Design a binder for this molecule. Structure first.
Ligand code: NA
Lengths: 299, 300, 298, 299
């Protein structure tokens, strides 16, 4: 792993044949498509990867297979978030055993607590982990953000090397950048792709952007444009990312519109299965048709 | 397994010697204490049982040990809620194999947009279950409740036999009571013990009350007084229940003060280990001191 | 003014002829209907009264007319809640000048982050008020409820005589009842009519029940049956209340289904105008016809 | 007045001598300070102006004095949001009679169920207003945003000329930019100052930034550097903005710390009274001491 991890780091979907069956052939296709597209690392079992909805055995298979297929060509980050900390540590050990480079952890959804309790949780977790850690802020779930100073503090431990934000809240994100400005080796990553460009312009290291599963070259181009402040390219490419956001992710009449749209598009592009794990369901033909048309209108 | 299941149905704590180690001897003492205290069933892996936060292995051990120790003396209800439907169904099958009488299920936190999907979720789930099911309304995470009409509809399935609510919202609970009033065999249970008495007075079948881990006799006596509308006795005992609620469940400074306080008291009562699994930080001395004091004020 | 205030205390709708015009004749009829139905006090400018949606002028007119019409026959409670403390104290002073007996206040949404601030809010407001005060827990907006210990502490002031909860959370309500049980002059009132009976059974003093605008005698009868633990009557009458709840309050597709249903019924019953103030609007005929039908089926 | 309204548009504090008494002399000093500082408009009775917590009388005095003092030198925008539509329309008419240029409106917190109802709210409001309107997305209360398509739709009305976002969610803001990209005349403004630079870089028209009460030149300079993509200067000035945010707005033990700090700083700077209306109260000696230290550490 490069210090600081930078660039586009797609959160892989977990392609499925069935609720409890990994689509290994499509995983292979996806990973080659990403690598050939110039992405900088692979991120497995994120939200985009349906981690929580999958069985334990299937999560282990996604890790093992991703590590096998990638064959050291790129760093692999494994999201170890789990309601059970024991199970979280076990995923971390699996990851180390199969050659992953780092783990990624958000506190459990039910862990609505104060900051001192967040700090103590991580202080007790870190000794148990065999790989460097990225902290994962996904606020909806806890109703509690890592406070900037809390990130400062946990980032003292040399086993903590970065931070991924999936708040779309950029006031919060800039507050953490400011708090971390004297530790420039600490990787500051942004989840939502719609704000990757503007965040990178202001010094964010990279984007953990789900749309890069589809069009890795687009997101890598936009990242580089933003990095070098080529403003005409930033504007032209941002409009494409935004068209995708408005057209590929908004078809659901039943929830998880982003995940269903992404997975449908991946199947339409011939990359991997669009099977979505229960209790959710893949797009049927009407919605799928809309995703087809949206895809043709991007070009 | 009485239809409708009624009375006091404690949500057992899952006693732990360590994050991943079941306190078997403490579980045995707890169960005997509950049985001798007159409760009508045992409910495992509820919120009180920390189910989300335990490993798969430990959840299974809780189920297996509880069924073994109960020895058929009381119905055992197993909460099978999980973020993964496959793990959920596995837990149900494990429960059936080990002699449990029913399962209890809430849809996963991240799930229900609306009512028609709630209906579908259960329509898909039911054919996979080997035991009768109680629906569990736990709206804290997923802002959407089961609408009254939704419960009516799901309850038509002969494999759905009741409903447990842990909203403390009794306007909602009364709305479901009215919707289900022509199905007197469908068990309507209330979680929070502070509203058990008033709900049973108005026809609820029982209370899934955590305090009964500590003092099963108090909740059983209150349930019976409510059932019989012995108002003097209802008021006398309701005060003790509220005292326990104000002094045992409020120490943490966190929403999870209830669990930490309850397990702390159970250890101070000699029943089982007080240990709460990570991620939760243990009570330090000042907090344990308040629990000890609250218990001394109740004559322990 | 009976201490503790008890029984049925309807939150009067504010009857309107237009967005900024009071329906005075309807208000007169409503008050006569409530008094004849045996209610024990009148509560104006509650959420049932559309307070926040009305102009200052119309809030003042409702206070003035309600007091004139009641002519001392029943205690009048006025909700003074407002985002401006100055405006809230102005409503309190007007209420006093026109013969109201008490004021009712919730802290504004934006203010409450903690218990110490709620204490300080009331410590600062109380010396400005010319009438006794009921505290109330703002139903939706706020993140922060009055903690039971905070209510104990605020009620150390003799100018604080009660608490009304519009949360439908009876665990919370029981926690407050328990903290206040040893103050015999302190009135504990429950807003939502669906839980009035069970709460009175366990010692609540009364109900601030919107349905009593339509059928005051029914809610009074249920209150007395609960108060006296006549369980057969409690059950019989609770079922009628729940039927109202299921059928009169559930017709709206657009929000504020309770208020639009209630006002629609009041007009169909011949009591007062159904007009609802902008930005909301009264039911049009498709929905009104359903309320009519539901009424015919009680 | 200028279409689209652009630049720095400070949400003025409402300077007070007491809970219900306007500090007229402070307000004059404040407005002269903003004008000389190069701002492009004045926005009165926003959140920063404490509108909700002030009496109707005081809100009217703020409007009247602000228009009198500005003397046509700069557009005046007036927040007319109120739980009562009758009261809101009355403030708009008062604004018009005193020569304000536009009104700013959010729907009342309780109201919005859905998008169709937001549209109808504005359809009924618009014929009643005597000035052009800016829509604004209420930061905390509503729990239902203007969807992008909703903004497109309301913006067809010639009486609606802009949009101000205070949410701090830049995924959402970029979604609305994308929806409004074919109507360049429609003014798109961001409230929170910490993300003004990044939003302007990507084409936002302006910043309704409270910190501009204290240091108008700094925010105008940052706006211009973002506008022209002068990146070295964006970085230099963003660091100062983030220092103000970290050190002036964080002294309270409260959510109120932004307002108390801003007003304390304004007083220490000789501009206007620091008085804060009940139920809040201005910083006493200790906190005031900390704010002064913070100010000396900026410069
Ligand atoms: Na059934």
């Amino acid at each position: 792993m490069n210090i600081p991890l930078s660039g586009i780091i797609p959160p892989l979907v977990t392609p499925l044949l069935d609720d409890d069956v990994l689509d290994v052939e499509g995983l292979q296709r996806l990973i080659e498509h990403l690598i050939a597209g110039g992405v900088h690392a692979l991120f497995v079992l994120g939200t985009t990867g349906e981690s929580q909805s999958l069985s334990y055995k299937l999560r282990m298979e996604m890790i093992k297979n991703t590590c096998r297929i990638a064959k050291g060509r790129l760093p692999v980050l494994v999201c170890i978030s789990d309601t059970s900390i024991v199970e979280s540590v076990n995923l971390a050990c699996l990851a180390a055993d199969h050659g992953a480079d780092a783990v990624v952890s958000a506190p459990p959804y039910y862990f609505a607590t104060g900051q001192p309790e967040l700090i103590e949780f991580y202080e007790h977790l870190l000794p148990q982990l065999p790989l460097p850690l990225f902290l994962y802020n996904m606020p909806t779930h806890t109703k509690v953000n890592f406070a900037p100073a809390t990130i400062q503090r946990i980032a003292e431990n040399p086993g903590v090397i970065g931070f991924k934000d999936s708040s779309a809240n950029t006031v919060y994100f800039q507050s953490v950048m400011y708090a971390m400005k004297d530790n420039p080796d600490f990787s500051m990553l942004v989840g939502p792709e719609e704000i990757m460009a503007e965040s990178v312009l202001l010094g964010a290291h990279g984007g953990v952007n789900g749309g890069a599963n589809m069009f890795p070259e687009l997101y890598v181009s936009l990242y580089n444009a933003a990095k070098n402040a080529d403003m005409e390219e930033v504007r032209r490419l941002q409009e494409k990312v935004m068209q995708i956001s408005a057209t590929i992710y908004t078809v659901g009449q039943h929830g998880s519109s982003y995940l269903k749209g992404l997975k449908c598009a991946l199947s339409l592009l011939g990359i991997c299965s669009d099977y979505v794990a229960a209790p959710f369901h893949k797009f049927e033909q009407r919605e799928r048709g809309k995703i087809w048309k949206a895809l043709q209108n991007l070009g």
